Structure 1
């Protein structure tokens, strides 16, 4: 029936059919998967770290199982085979129903088994899985082909077996050829998210926690909620392409609700989150989108999803990101007739930093050469389909402008290759392009280094160094495939009468004043008069201004070779009042060389140094033994913070925790003593954060070393 299709879609790893026990000789008393987390199997499969009771193993690699019989296995007349099935509608044709046959010799990526030793009643087999196997939780049944009918085992929940990707197996589409890379990109459950701005790069630890109790199952849960076809779950392109779309909630849909309002009335403010665990568990339990996440939060969660299933993944930060670009390689900045920054239209904003992920895999859907790191960005933005995550887009294709190859490459290409165009919004409704900035746009792309907590400059992966031939070509190539530069930048724009002008912003602290030094370097043998303008705005990290806080203006003169340094002083009581969550200010320093009428423009942004939370541990750093932990946060502002949430986190040390303090008087210090009883050995981190209805985006971490 259902003229649509013979058997209904097999899309729930949770739905299960029960295979018939009896459609005759030999019957299995017991099956012995050599589970145990210190045992050969999990260990050799690099799955020993999952807090999981069932056997977890990796596709394309063998494992041992011992089947116990009612009487010696007799190789002459006795015949049996293992079965692996998934979904409510297996179909051997589709990979959901898999019969492992007892064979002589195991060969290249082909399901198979070998009696590796047989004794009184027990055969120890070495079963191998196919490197293209589907990823999920399978059911195992041992069948015996009696001449009358096949009689198989019963539904035994204790034999459920998970099969994950295997970055270690050379035939797996997700194979990382380096061990160091595999520990970092797959095995590490802690990571670092780089934020702030290029000149003042800040960092913060995040608990990926892929091995934490219940994550594996919820990742499977995610795909089910996505009705993801089971035969697709063994393909990296689709897992990631589908997973990435569930991360951000489209009303009731995905995992996290996005929010960039400095309030966060009904959820946990994005800045609060210490890791993924907290979020995924809440999702599963609630079966509803978690309240409030933002760009680096979406990447943190998605990175858990990839590393848990076994796909090599990493979080990347782009400095000065052209998100919401619609494939335009030009961001507009509108100027006033005189030269001041116009604000009627200057709605487009660059992000101080933007976080997206990179997943490792091959691309057999593309020419050979585009495999490796694929950029996937769960933070939606309009693409060909309409406001969705973007990618996988091959980084290597991004780099050379082959934006015609799939998964939204152009929208991820324009994020790191746009030109700033400064235009004059004249009177007669006309516009004139003054100057163009081709270098602000994707200054630094960074990711946590394999070594430890340092940053790693991966900029050259997405782009070539400026002025070199290829760079001009890559850009001109992307333009052939749909990327657009609408404002013809006719010919040249400026010359600056070779008047140079920069300006450093002394990185201050919350509440402190700081100076903003402006600099003109007259390189010519002439005298020029300049009317430079200063516009300082309070902005969200996305670059959306909340209000302009200081708008000074300078007449300055540069005689032939007159290098003249002008200086402003930003006053604490001036910004302190309207500051937003990340404490970033943005400045616009435009200018007009009155002689030639060369508008000069530069902009930068700065973040106010908010200070660390202090975590200190007293006690015995030994697994299974109490350890006391102290989080100490000192209210830096001279104002009282109210309803202060402090969060302690640490994979292997504690389940994420929260506590509240009604208030914290100005300049006061609070203390939180919490005992943790670890279960993981080695290098671990405690992670902390603080959020109050006033200030937030404060963190702290400590690397403790534990043993047994």
Structure 2
């Protein structure tokens, strides 16, 4: 056909039927059953699936009943696995599994583990590099006139996932604790807020829930992904992440940061990946709407479900859309005030990306392990896409020369803020530089429980360390950018905001230390704005200039008060507030700068249960939320979730008068034993990004 002899098979759903005729089998028994050896041994017993699911590079048992006794003399047969529509032994999409005296490592094969009166028990092993997907099983009998082969049989469809338990698999992770956490765990916690006030919230990955695995295969099919590569964790993450953010009626989620969300579910409402993945599957069109942590919850569900050890990572004060520039420009005016016309770039209060576990045989030795993949697009070499998989280890050392998109995730965590006064005659002069703001704290969920784990030391060295300065020296050599010459760049200023609840008042003190044996005349300015979590300004709710005289060896503190009415009028979804404080030392003309952010605390949702905490047993769940506003919250949606206990659900209240409390009781029949969890979220026409949860423990 001009282009290629055979078309590409980039669909695991398209199937071809192998001919039945160019000894015979009567029944093929696999030991599926979620209690049986196979599933229990492959660690695929939690999957709500009624087919055999194994993990590559490992043996599993199967049994073939022949019409007559298998005789090693005049008999010859082999099990066949085939995927997609144009199988090719050449591409790994047609695997003849030959009978062997013993199984070698890294090769396919079947040992006749035992035979008894017309049946043969088999031990089948698979290559540790096997294509991940859902294969078809057949049994071929090689007669002197042609192969005789089984008919199409759905109940034998075997799923072959990645295998972090196998040391020959690139996805290998050598620690059962981590294995459980990064692969087996189907509940997760997402960190946000601001570096000073870390807020957490649970998300449901739900990889083992009914259907999720088949949709993970659907995304790939939708990406027209060559089957020959689904066995590559790299290209798998490379393609998988590009599918997450809907590039025009294409991907999974439709991103959006417009506090309206004109026609869908506000990003702040979702409780997990489940209903999201199932909605994409059923509608077959992008789901509206999503934002970083959402994209992150979903991509993580996709990975874990296939068996690639993944986890979500949150960076505080993220320099997004850096275009590999290591500098953020803050434009101060001649008298010292932040210039709003020019200052157009912002630091995100926080940003969430993923890390995947794998080896990097495409790079030198030492860069394998955790890989950074950011599904939130930004301009990189290809032009506005997801970034990664970039080796966190190389990032740490500044080796941004190795793929993929490493110079852009490096800048997310290493940028500097440059305070530059643009003279009114059209000139510039950089007054100061803040090397310590961006990438102040990078964090993730710990292995034990719902705690926090500081993984900052992994992306970067400690400041001042030559290794730190070296990584910069290196980064700068292969694509890092520091366009402004910061040449020549004794008062110590710093301020603090006390965190408050939504609707209440708070203080913001400014401290001024003067170590010199002399006095100064400072002129300060406080500028408070209302911002999106991305750090983008909506408005300046409070401006305030100060006039401070500093005696030598003086230390003066001033206290400003932010009254609730000064902000309650114009707040945004995540309750973010940004503070800028700059000063001029009239004598020497030095400009001091400092900026911080805070979020207002939102009261949680209450989840309470009564009944029988037993699988199969009806257990009633009670949900209740109190509208803590002096206004009536309209069109209130409360979301309920809890994998293994409840499928996701949601309810709506036309309105909730100021200060009244609602309640929602639904009865669930927990289908999983052990510690499970219940998760709630709130979203209305105004207040949203409200969450609640509960630690149930199902019995049986």
Whole-Å separation in 2 of the counterparts to 1:470 and 1:694: 48
Partner of 1:261: 258
Cα distance, 1:74 vs. partner?
Answer: 0.9
Deviations 1:428-482 (A, max 9, x none): 1101000000010110000000011111000010000000111001011101001
CA positional deviation for 1:524: 1.7
SS of the equivalent of 2:96 reads strand
Aligned to 1:207: 204
Match for residue 167 of structure 2?
170
1:486-531: CA deviation from partner (whole Å, max 9, x where unpaired): 0111232xxxxx1111111000110001001111111222111110
Q: In 1, Cα distance between the equivalents of 2:558 and 2:79? A: 80
5 Å matches for 1:332-347? Answer: 332-347=329-344
Helix, strand or coil: the match of 1:511? coil
Q: Which residue of 2 aligns with 1:520?
A: 512
Query: What do residues 410-445 of structure 1 show as CA deviations (whole Å, max 9, x unaligned)?
Result: 000000000000110111110100000001011000
| Partner residue, 1:431 | 428
**Structure 1 stretch displaced more, 311-320 or 516-525:** 516-525
- How far residue 69 of structure 1 moved from its aligned partner, in angstroms, is 0.8
Aligned length: 699
Q: Distance in 2 between matches of 1:346 and 1:120?
A: 83
Residue 674 (1) aligns with residue 666 (2): yes
Distance in 2, Cα, partners of 1:663 & 1:620: 33
CA distance in 2, matches of 1:140, 1:523: 79
Query: Which whole-Å CA distance do the structure 2 matches of 1:672 and 1:190 have between them?
Result: 23
- Tell me, what secondary structure is at the counterpart of 2:335? coil
| Cα deviation, residue 667, structure 1 | 1.0
Per-residue CA deviations over 1:576-614 (Å, capped at 9, x if unaligned) read: 011000001000000111111110000000000001100
Please, what TM-score do these two structures have when normalized by structure 2?
Answer: 0.99
1:474 corresponds to which residue? 471
SS in 2 for 1:114: strand
Measured in 1, the distance between the counterparts of 2:44 and 2:645 equals 19
Which string of whole-angstrom CA distances, capped at 9 and with x for unpartnered residues, describes residues 9-42 of structure 1?
01100000100001xxx11000001000011000
Gaps of 5+ in 1: 493-497
1:631 Cα offset (Å): 1.0
The alpha-carbon deviation at position 561 of structure 1 amounts to 1.5
Q: State the distance in 1 between where 2:194 and 2:333 align.
A: 27
Aligned CA-pair RMSD: 0.6
Correspondence 1:656 to 2:655: no
1:341 CA displacement: 0.5
Task: State the distance in 1 between where 2:518 and 2:622 align.
Answer: 63
Secondary structure in 1 matching 2:429: strand
- Is structure 2 residue 90 aligned with structure 1 residue 90? no
Distance 1:489 1:128 in 2: 61
Matched, 1:489 2:486: yes
Secondary structure, counterpart of 2:414 in structure 1:
coil
3-state DSSP class of the match of 1:223?
helix
CA distance in 1, matches of 2:604, 2:69: 67
CA apart distance, 1:316: 0.2
**Equivalence for 2:623:** 631
Could you list the per-position Cα deviations for residues 615-669 of structure 1 after superposition, in whole angstroms to 9, with x for gaps in the alignment?
0111111000111111111111111100000000000010101000111111110
Write the distance in 2 (CA, Å) between the matches of 1:425 and 1:508.
36
SS at match of 1:473: helix
Measure the CA separation in 2 of the matches of 1:568 and 1:84: 72
What is the deviation of 1:683?
A: 1.0
Q: Name the SS for the 1:644 alignment partner.
A: strand
Distance 2:594 2:655 in 1: 42
**Aligned mates of 1:526, 1:676 — CA distance in 2:** 71
Q: Deviations over 1:382-425 (max 9, x none)?
A: 10001000000000000000000001000000000000001101
Deviation at 1:675, TM superposition (A): 0.6
The partner residue of 2:561 within 555, 569, 574 is 569
Q: Does 1:580 align with 2:572?
A: yes
How far did 1:565 drift?
Answer: 0.4
| Residues 531-564 of structure 1: CA deviation (Å, up to 9, x unaligned) | 0100000000000100000001100111111110
Partner of 2:566, secondary structure, is helix
Determine the structure 2 residue equivalent to 1:495.
none
> Residue in 1 aligned with 2:6?
7
Q: Shift of the alpha carbon at 1:324?
A: 0.6
* Cα distance in 1 for residues equivalent to 2:685 and 2:218: 33
Q: 2:279 is paired with a residue of what secondary structure?
A: helix
**Alpha-carbon displacement from aligned partner over 1:225-266 (angstroms, at most 9, x marks no partner):** 000000000000000000000000011110000000001110
Deviations 1:159-180 (A, max 9, x none): 0000000000000000001100
Offset at residue 215 of structure 1 (A): 0.5
TM-superposed CA distance for 1:64, in Å, is: 0.3
What's the CA shift string for 1:189-209, capped at 9, x where partnerless?
000000000000000000000
Residue number in structure 1 paired with 2:177: 180
Measure how far apart 1:75 and its partner are: 1.2
Question: 1: CA distance between counterparts of 2:589 and 2:620?
Answer: 66
| Distance of 2:528 and 2:64 partners within structure 1 | 73
CA distance in 2, matches of 1:311, 1:147: 44
2:620 aligns to what SS in structure 1?
strand
| Aligned equivalents of 1:613, 1:215: Cα separation in 2 | 27
In structure 1, what is the equivalent of residue 591 of structure 2? 599
| Structure 2 CA distance for aligned equivalents of residues 680 and 73 of structure 1 | 42
Q: Distance in 1 between matches of 2:496 and 2:250?
A: 45
Distance 2:134 2:699 in 1: 32
| 1: CA distance, partners of 2:300 / 2:139 | 36
**Matched residues in 1 for 2:103 and 2:112: separation?**
11
Q: CA deviation at 1:76?
A: 1.1
Q: Distance in 2 between matches of 1:292 and 1:100?
A: 46
Distance 1:557 1:475 in 2: 39
Shift of 1:145: 0.6
Which residue matches 1:499? Answer: 491
Structure-2 separation of matches of 1:488 and 1:393: 29
Q: Matches of 2:487 and 2:590 in 1, distance apart?
A: 16
- Structure 1 residue 3 displacement after superposition: 1.7
Q: CA separation in 2, counterparts of 1:491 and 1:184?
A: 49
- Give distance in 1, aligned partners of 2:118 and 2:422: 88
What CA distance in whole angstroms lies between the structure 1 residues aligned with 2:26 and 2:59? 23
Q: What SS class does the counterpart of residue 479 from structure 1 fall into?
A: helix
Distance 1:176 1:223 in 2: 24
Distance in 2 (alpha carbons) for counterparts of 1:200 and 1:435: 27
- List per-residue Cα deviations over 1:100-122 (Å, max 9, x = no partner): 00110101110000110001111
Distance 2:496 2:426 in 1: 35
CA distance in 1 between counterparts of 2:79 and 2:53 reads: 17
User: Using the alignment, how far apart are the partners of 2:60 and 2:533 within structure 1?
Assistant: 49
Q: After superposition, what is the alpha-carbon deviation per residue over 1:268-323, rounded to whole angstroms, capped at 9, x for unaligned?
A: 00000000001000000000000010000000000000000000000000000011
CA distance in 2, matches of 1:341, 1:11: 54
Tell me the alpha carbon deviations over residues 307-358 of structure 1, each in whole angstroms, 9 at most, x when there is no partner.
0000000000000001111000000100011001001111100000000000
Q: 1:17: which partner in 2?
A: 16
Q: Tell me the equivalent position of 1:614.
A: 606
Structure 2 counterpart SS, 1:113: strand
Residue 604 of structure 1 aligns to a residue in which SS? strand
> 1:21-72, CA deviations, whole angstroms, 9 ceiling, x for partnerless residues?
01xxx11000001000011000000000000001000000010000011011
Q: Which runs of 4+ in 1 moved over 2 A?
A: none
Q: Secondary structure, in 3 states, of the residue corresponding to 1:41? A: helix
